[PDB]
């Protein structure tokens, strides 16, 4: 018994650490992403202005 | 070599036009001719030739 629940509580936090990780992870990806919308801006002005 | 400007928000969504003039706008069929057509703009011709 204590050994599952201890490790059990130990997975939770372990769970909650992965959570963060991923949301690091999804934050550099949230400004990744910004700055493939900025590119989409340029190469819409860029395709105007190639002529 | 046609002035594709950018008209929309994805791809295809694009309008070209065409621009010409200069001295010879007179006549033509693709381009202008000699004597006539070109120099009717270019010369205009009056100098002493309607006398």
Redesign the interface.
């Known amino acids: 018994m204590r050994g599952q629940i201890r490790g059990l509580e130990m997975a939770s936090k372990n769970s909650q650490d992965g959570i963060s990780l991923i949301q690091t992870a999804e934050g550099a990806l949230t400004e990744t992403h910004a700055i493939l919308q900025r590119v989409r801006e340029l190469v819409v002005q860029a395709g105007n202005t190639g002529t | 070599?046609?002035?594709?400007?950018?008209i929309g928000?994805n791809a295809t969504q694009?309008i070209?036009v065409n621009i010409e003039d200069m001295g010879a706008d007179a006549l033509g069929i693709k381009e202008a001719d000699g004597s006539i057509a070109a120099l009717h703009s270019v010369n205009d011709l009056d100098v002493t030739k309607f006398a």
Request: charged letters at 10%; glycine letters at 0%.
């Open positions: 070599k046609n002035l594709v400007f950018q928000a694009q070209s």
